[PDB]
Amino acid sequence: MNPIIYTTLIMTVMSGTMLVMISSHWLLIWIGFEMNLLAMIPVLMKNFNPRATEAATKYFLTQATASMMLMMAIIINLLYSGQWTITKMFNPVAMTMMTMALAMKLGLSPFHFWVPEVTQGISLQAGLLLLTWQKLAPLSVLCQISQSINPNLMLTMAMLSILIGGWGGLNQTQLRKIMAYSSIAHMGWMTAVLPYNTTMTILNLLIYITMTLAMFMLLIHSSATTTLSLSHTWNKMPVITSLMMVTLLSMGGLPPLSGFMPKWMIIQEMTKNESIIMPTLMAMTALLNLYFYMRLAYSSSLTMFPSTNNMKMKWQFEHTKQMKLLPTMIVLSTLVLPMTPALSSLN
Amino acid sequence: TMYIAFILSTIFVIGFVGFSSKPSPIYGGLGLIVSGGVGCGIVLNFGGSFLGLMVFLIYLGGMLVVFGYTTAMATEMYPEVWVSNKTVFGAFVSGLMMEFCMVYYALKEEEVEIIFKFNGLGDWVIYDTGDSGFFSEEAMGIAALYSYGTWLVIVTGWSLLIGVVVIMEITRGN
Amino acid sequence: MFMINILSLIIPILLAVAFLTLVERKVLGYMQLRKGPNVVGPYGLLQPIADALKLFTKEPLRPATSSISMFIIAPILALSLALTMWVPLPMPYPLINMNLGVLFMLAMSSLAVYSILWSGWASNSKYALIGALRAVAQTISYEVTLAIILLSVLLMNGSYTLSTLITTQEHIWMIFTSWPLAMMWFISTLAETNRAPFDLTEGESELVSGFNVEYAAGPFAMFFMAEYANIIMMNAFTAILFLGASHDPHTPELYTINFVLKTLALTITFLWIRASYPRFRYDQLMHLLWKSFLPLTLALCMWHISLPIMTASIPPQS
Amino acid sequence: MPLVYMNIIMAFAIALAGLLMYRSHLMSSLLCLEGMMLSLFIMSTLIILNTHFTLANMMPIILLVFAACEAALGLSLLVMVSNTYGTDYVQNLNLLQC
Amino acid sequence: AGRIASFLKNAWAKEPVLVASFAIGGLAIILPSLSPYTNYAIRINRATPYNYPVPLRDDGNMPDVPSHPQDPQGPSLEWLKNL
Amino acid sequence: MNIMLTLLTNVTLASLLVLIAFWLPQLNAYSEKTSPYECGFDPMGSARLPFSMKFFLVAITFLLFDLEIALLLPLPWASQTNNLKTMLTMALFLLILLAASLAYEWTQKGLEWAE
Amino acid sequence: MWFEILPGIAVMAACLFIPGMATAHIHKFTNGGKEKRVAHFSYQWNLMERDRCISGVNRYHVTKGLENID
Amino acid sequence: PGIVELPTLEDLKVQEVKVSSSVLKAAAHHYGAQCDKPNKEFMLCRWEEKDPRRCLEEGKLVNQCALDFFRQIKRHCAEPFTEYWTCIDYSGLQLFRHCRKQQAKFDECVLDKL
Ligand SMILES: CCCCCCCCCCCCCCCCCC(=O)OC[C@H](COP(=O)([O-])OCC[N+](C)(C)C)OC(=O)CCCCCCCCCCCCCCCCC
């Protein structure tokens, strides 16, 4: 694909997301979603192969179904209220349709399978863009319409997302599938805290985006897509493996790393609303995410797996391309716990 | 009354039941064309002649490409029709019976569905007494896409250009 | 009385179709140095009757591999839409005075496209399938070009009403106003009606009768009637759109005579073109409209948007 | 609410159920996807015309535009899948596993 | 201007349809901004009375608002009559 | 009412013509009479097999351009507005974007049929 | 010669005369000897309905005037 | 939430203007120029009150002015007006364009007589 075409497709995806985030009209929000999907599909299919084609097909089908449900919700809300402005929806059925459509777009359980399937199908850069941006937009819409979200349905989907992400990531060995299940679990956390504090939702979104960017940039640097492929990186550049081990510890929520701040603030906020069973279950379920993070860390950094013979030539050569802002992502994803009270600025 | 719009709505639902039972893409396109024409009739009765003719023309053009694509990529030795396959016929009969139950119950009594509440009375009664003069309100509202709706024109044109670029890129292969 | 009006619109149209068959035979004969039908009746006037009776007394057959439901529907749809295209035409008073008298024509033409597609697919024959796909490609090309050309020409008019077209052309002719769009529209009408040089769906030399290879006796005659009715209807549409006749409300017969004369001239031009020219190749037809007509059509659409604004001559809405 | 809206919403529900229940062909699912937006168009224009929302008459046109943009996207993906596997069957889209 | 002239000559010999299309489009874009009749078209469209001219309550300080349609006050279409 | 009546009239006439065609003449049909036609020899395969479509991309572009003509159709009423400058600017914007799409496809060889 | 094509063209022209002339005659016959009223808008339709109401015979083409006001 | 107040059938009675649409369209500009005062008063009442029940007297005055105008036309120029509206009535669209001669005769009749 031509570089100009690639950059204009990326700019069109970002334009669609910005249209969603700045529009006050439901029709314009739907237009933004449609533009985002339309420009996103070729980005997934950039590196042509059967896996990329299948991932793009599944993602397109899921997003088209979600967009149809979202438009139906918009029309139903218009019927009972005659309003197009994005505010508290005036019909419970329209709200249920909108919530299910946005959950399907975000990949929340039980609409999750496409997330690991597409993430394994597509390359590392495509997966990074997918996770980050395509979680950024629907969560913006949900934060806008939070005051009419049904707490029971939202919390049920969030808990299902957390459990399913933990179990799937526990079973998987492929790095992209592990990242997808981690994304599912973090989406569960954020949507669980959504009906109480959209500021906490945004804080968790920022921390998750930073950690995911750092992890995907490290994976791109190591050029590893499986566990065994990552197990050879210690013999070529052990710094990358150490930084990735620290990032993995952060993603599990271990103090005093950055990953503990979202869980801590979400638990506090949800406890303020006289909810204890849900925060306790959400905290206890994250141990599965921590377990498969630790299993990945054992293979890559804390131990030394066998290597091969051409790794000598790999030693002789040097990494040419540079991914700027990677050190900043590594710092911000591990060492921003003391700066927690900035969430008021985020407010 | 004459129940013209209601009969057309029933035909619309029947065509949807057909192409959702999905015998083959040929008959699905036939059912979709029938549904588009009947919906054009419905909205013609409700007032929007331009919108009805527009949607009918758009779907007639769209199903033309689908015919060429199913002849090329979605055909088998024995294409399935509604009575050909047990599953297709079962789904078709299930849809027909569900529609029949809904219409019969709504006609007999004011049916309150588990989802919405529908009142059994006249689509003619729901209309409005007031009227315009020497211009079509639908036509003026649609033509306002250029005086008003500058943003909509921009986003739609960019979406179409990007769609052309996208269909160029996807089918590139290699 | 409305049923009497419908019958008066229908039956003379079929009579004109049959005698257009005869006229085309004789015109091609005399352009090819022959005589054409002159034996069956006085100057061959009974030849259409003989052909119709033979076709409707001959045995029709259904192919063993054919899908019978869509095999029967296609001629019905073709003839029904061919007859339906005549209801909004003002001569000078339309049978049905539609407010949007052009979008109905476009929609019914696009629906009449599917008659040949379903006849070819239902026939379950290779030549019928090839004819059907040629119809698909031809429909694509002429559909986009016709849409833009018609939009521009009616933009010069003010609305989508054919009586309004008459009122617009009261003084001068749209042929004088917009002759390039007129030439491209004439080519597009040829392509739409599947006449030479664009008779690709039924190309006798390349395919054995194309989509109607398996159609015989009455069902074939229905396709022939639909084709000729569409030819006359599109020539009448072109005459109304570009050659505007003067209208006298107290004696509307003069408008009818002028309209019929213009329609006959355009139909004879159709036959003249068929006699004169070879046949296109459907990919060359697709490249003819998309690569030649479409750019110039877009340019002329921009020009005809800008012209009334820049000359303070925007037509009245009503 | 009159029964016309009931029938239109029922049509949308039927089209949605048809999409979510594949049989063999990706093309048939695309046809079901096109029916959903047809029902949405009809419902939206019936609501707008009844309430005389004059400026809202341009919404259904944009709805149709993005409907056929989605249709184009689906056709492109379908032709790529057909070139890959020889048939448009959805059973062949199983290389990736959840 | 020699290179431009050579390009135009080659395009006219090769793609007259494209040359004509681009010329017509350029004329359609440039000309409306220069024609003095665009404002006349705007005024003609503005002068079309689609809806009823609802009268205004007279509070005694409306000298330029006529009390009768035939009074000298108010808009005049004399410019339109001879056009 | 009148449009429904005339549609019914046309469909009824066509159906009556079909009925006359299929019931008036004498019928004598056997296996070879109704066999598929392949210029005198039996068909090698089946007509229901996939038939390659060399202009698949042009069909999708036709879908998009049909959308374009749908957008452009309400222009005659749009010329009656007071905001003539804005209307003309947006109409020319749409037409220029359509021309740009055509130019891009042509230059990238989307209009050339597959070999 | 070439003029033997004329009789077929003459018959076709006569056949094409019938629809328009018949429609005009039926319009005049069913509208009281006048052109059929064209109501492209709600205002014109309301004019037709008011004409039906004022006539007193349920026919819009029956027109009443000064002799009817007094 | 209350009972809708509806005027009785007795006070809705008024002398109707029983002319046809062609007759009204023939004497349209003259009627607008002559009975402008009651028509403008009634339209102002309708657009300010936003209630059909509060401007019945203005409607009756409009009817009275229209009847006086038509009686004044009939007493002086019955024949030219009859010819004018007969000409206008024939056209399906009721076009002023086709009846310029009769319009001129009617204008001459009303300019001198009245
Ligand atoms: C109960 C009847 C069931 C019929 C089922 C079959 C037909 C389905 C479509 C609806 C009925 C037909 C149209 C009714 C219109 C009613 C309103 C009306 O009269 O409006 C006047 C309007 C008048 O035009 P106007 O709307 O511009 O003007 C408004 C009115 N005046 C003039 C006063 C300003 O008529 C039209 O606009 C004509 C539109 C015709 C559209 C036809 C659509 C259907 C085409 C066939 C569809 C099926 C294809 C099947 C293919 C083969 C399958 C095997």
Ligand SMILES: CCCCCCCCCCCCCCCCCC(=O)OC[C@H](COP(=O)([O-])OCC[N+](C)(C)C)OC(=O)CCCCCCCCCCCCCCCCC
């Ligand atoms: C321009 C018009 C266009 C549309 C034209 C539509 C068709 C019009 C046809 C009109 C004439 C039809 C004549 C009958 C055709 C019979 C065909 C056939 O198969 O025949 C062989 C068959 C032969 O039967 P058979 O008994 O020998 O069958 C045994 C055959 N073998 C041995 C091979 C198995 O004849 C019949 O079946 C008898 C038919 C009798 C007539 C049927 C009704 C016709 C009514 C016509 C109008 C009458 C008007 C009133 C009288 C006027 C008198 C001046």
Ligand SMILES: CCCCCCCCCCCCCCCCCC(=O)OC[C@H](COP(=O)([O-])OCC[N+](C)(C)C)OC(=O)CCCCCCCCCCCCCCCCC
């Ligand atoms: C007005 C409505 C017409 C509907 C369609 C009727 C068919 C005719 C259509 C118009 C064209 C006419 C052309 C000329 C005549 C030829 C066609 C014709 O008339 O054919 C008649 C057919 C002709 O048979 P045929 O198969 O020999 O037809 C070919 C005819 N020739 C030889 C001329 C080519 O004859 C009959 O149908 C006679 C028996 C009548 C009674 C039985 C009818 C069928 C069974 C129905 C009942 C089943 C249950 C029984 C128990 C009931 C009680 C429980």
Ligand SMILES: CCCCCCCC/C=C/CCCCCCCC(=O)OC[C@H](COP(=O)(O)OCCN)OC(=O)CCCCCCC/C=C/CCCCCCCC
């Ligand atoms: C309405 C009644 C009028 C009917 C007109 C009929 C004309 C006579 C009948 C002719 C027989 C028609 C059958 C033949 C069909 C084929 C026609 C045909 O081939 O023409 C297409 C042919 C291209 O084909 P090729 O040369 O092979 O490919 C070019 C490769 N670079 O040429 C065309 O594209 C025609 C389009 C151009 C015609 C329009 C003229 C443009 C002149 C512009 C000047 C006017 C500018 C407008 C105003 C500008 C501001 C004042």
Ligand SMILES: CCCCCCCC/C=C/CCCCCCCC(=O)OC[C@H](COP(=O)(O)OCCN)OC(=O)CCCCCCC/C=C/CCCCCCCC
């Ligand atoms: C203008 C829309 C695009 C806006 C910017 C988006 C950039 C990213 C998206 C790219 C999609 C746009 C694709 C369209 C342009 C690309 C086409 C292209 O590359 O070539 C252009 C093509 C090349 O031809 P050749 O090289 O000679 O062919 C050789 C074959 N052997 O030539 C062209 O320029 C055709 C373009 C015609 C329409 C261009 C549209 C832009 C024109 C704008 C003029 C109006 C401006 C308004 C100002 C008003 C002043 C009062």
Ligand SMILES: CCCCCCCC/C=C\CCCCCCCC(=O)OC[C@H](COP(=O)(O)OCCN)OC(=O)CCCCCCC/C=C/CCCCCCCC
């Ligand atoms: C104004 C008063 C003065 C009048 C004189 C001014 C006239 C000059 C105005 C500019 C002229 C433009 C010349 C450019 C055309 C030449 C480009 C060219 O030759 O491209 C070559 C090449 C040849 O075609 P092939 O596919 O190779 O044929 C097959 C060979 N085996 O053509 C192409 O590649 C296609 C180029 C893009 C096509 C663009 C068509 C769509 C745009 C036209 C629509 C209307 C114009 C749009 C608005 C214009 C104003 C912005």
